[PDB]
Amino acid sequence: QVQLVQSGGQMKKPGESMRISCRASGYEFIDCTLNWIRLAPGKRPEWMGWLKPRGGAVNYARPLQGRVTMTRDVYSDTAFLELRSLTVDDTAVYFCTRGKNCDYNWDFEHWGRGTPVIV
Amino acid sequence: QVQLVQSGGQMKKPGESMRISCRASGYEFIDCTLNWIRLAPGKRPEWMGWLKPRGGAVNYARPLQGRVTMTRDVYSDTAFLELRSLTVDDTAVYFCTRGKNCDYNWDFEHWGRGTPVIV
Amino acid sequence: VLTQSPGTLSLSPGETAIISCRTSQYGSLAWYQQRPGQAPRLVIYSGSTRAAGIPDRFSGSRWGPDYNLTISNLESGDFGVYYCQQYEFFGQGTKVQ
């Protein structure tokens, strides 16, 4: 059973940064891509990026380039999402996800509990 | 060449305890059951017990239950026979033995030199 | 459990010794030779199989729940105390002289 456990219940003011810790278990962390997705109410979910936590390669969404950093602790099996320059439009539940198969990143069968963030 | 070397020639008074060591060589100590036999002169000889040194499992003769204890070391391949509450009927030559084929312990091909005990 | 007979055998060298041992149990019966001052080395096991190092003068044969050890041409190295064992139980012993 794959499980992603996310911290949350954070509230931030505009101009501050936020950091979300996603601890992964039930699969080999190193060998499978994790994604961060922004699910705001009302508007379409915005996929924020992917992290391949072996080399640490990242891909940040174009509108979020320069604002989002993703890192990993490969020894604690934990992915981290850092979002900077927060505004009121960043209110959303942030999710840590994994694809169904590690061959195909975007079949997100495994979602975390969610990280509500209100700005 | 399988050999059992016993320390003996011990004299004890009734009520005293005794310990007889048996150092074994020529075979894997762990893998073969070792037996302690009491050859009382002029009386039917009695097999005191068997000791499976791998786990140290032990089986004492019913007439001796509560008075005979057997222990061992497996880093120095030594078995120990310990008796308490000795009486005059415990005078005997005590032997440490091993079977011809460890699958059957009872046919005792290898005997120690013999440890007389006078009580 | 098992009764060995006779208690003593008076025999000169060259005679054949028959040592009987009756038992009320089904088990392999072994025979042990206790030379005075020495350990009771195994003579036979399984009721008829010789232990390594034992001359071919030692044998066993009988029918039913009874065993007999036949020792032909007794030498000066024999005439010890003979014991029968079945499954941890030992006969009272026969002294061969």
Place this chain on the structure above:
Amino acid sequence: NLWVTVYYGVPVWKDAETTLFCASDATEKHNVWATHACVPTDPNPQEIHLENVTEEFNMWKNNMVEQMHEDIISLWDQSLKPCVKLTPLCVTLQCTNVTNNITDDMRGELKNCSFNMTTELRDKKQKVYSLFYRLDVVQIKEYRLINCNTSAITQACPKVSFEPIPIHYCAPAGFAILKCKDKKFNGTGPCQNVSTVQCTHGIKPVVSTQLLLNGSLAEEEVIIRSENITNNAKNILVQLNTSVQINCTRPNNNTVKSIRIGPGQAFYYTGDIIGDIRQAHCNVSKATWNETLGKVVKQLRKHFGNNTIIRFAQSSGGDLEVTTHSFNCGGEFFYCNTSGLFNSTWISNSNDSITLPCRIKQIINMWQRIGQAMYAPPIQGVIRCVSNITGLILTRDGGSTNSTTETFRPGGGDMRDNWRSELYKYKVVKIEPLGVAPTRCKRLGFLGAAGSTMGAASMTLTVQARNLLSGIKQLQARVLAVEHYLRDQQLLGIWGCSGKLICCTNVPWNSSWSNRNLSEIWDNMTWLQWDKEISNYTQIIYGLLEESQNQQEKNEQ
């Protein structure tokens, strides 16, 4: 007249031992009793009842038990190979009793031990406070870990769990596993309901020493299996009819702390207990256990006199693995005092539980080996296990004079007994595809029709032959399968039979070779009975086949 005919693929086998391969159900299950050399298994693709086959089994003389002993030890050692060695932990411990802030003496048999230990850096040391069990330390106050002076203690990797998983042992090419389906089968002698399987039903390596946990149950009644019962040394393996539920617990939070003791080497230890210091224990259902002992003594009275007295008693002695019931529970190793169970006397004619005190060890010298020991890291939280007692290992006190009463105690000290109680119904056999039979020609799945008569069983030879040719020891087994195949094909080639499968040749049949006027040979006898009847003559028949083919080839060519 009668002539030798060679049949390749006859359903004939011998009691030959070999190396079986691992099969298991297909992340977290790859860190539990696994080497990653165990192939994915199939959902029981083949189980073929061998109708009219009677086979002789001996559960105490087979190489499946010895193979499990070797394979489980290797599996254990590989699980512990890429893990932290605790040589840095073999240090002098300054241990005091765990304190309650009062005058009460040691509770829980725990010792609070302050030691200086190595750190990630070699130039610095970290003082560590760890709650070790009394059974893990020896006084030298100053203490040392019990196995530091005799063995190299290896810490289990924290990701590795000791929960048992089913392991299926499978026949290599050229071999079959036979299963005994007889109900009440006592593991020895003839078996009437015999089947051919590629693999076992899945044997869980459930480590236990006195009671058999999470095993198979007897089909109709308690089965007491011993090579011989009157022999004390031969342990008595009791397979129960209906299990006895045993609820085991470690009622201590055992807050786990960890330190670095070297580059990449994390040592896990118990830091504190937030609640009261409580003894680990197991609850065996009292009514169920008493009924179970009733059934066991009824079966022993069937083995002994019907008017005898059967007394149960605590283990007579030995190490903790023998004197107590050892087992894994949730990652901790329990050593339960079974004197609360083996203490009744049964004389031939309430919802309460029997609580067995259990001691917990962290340094486990499993299989009582020389130079090896494992340190089980503590598990965070209160441990609960509900296990099924499906059997017992018993011994009987010897020196039984006044034989009206017999005394039985729990056994242990030889882990192979746990596997015997699971492998009691299995044996490994080598296929002998070359058979000879008298004929006048003078020129279903695997092992199906093995119990059929010959002739009828000679029309399935290709089904039998198709199951041939299907780390170091496994590759040697594969090469042996290839060499045996090639020796049979080479021998057929010498006979001029390599491509015929049924080869009629010019060798007269000798009437001394159980002639039986042919009608019995083909209408009454099976291939197994026939091979047994001429097992002392096949070398002569083979030599005559070689001579005849050589003479015919030289005369014709």
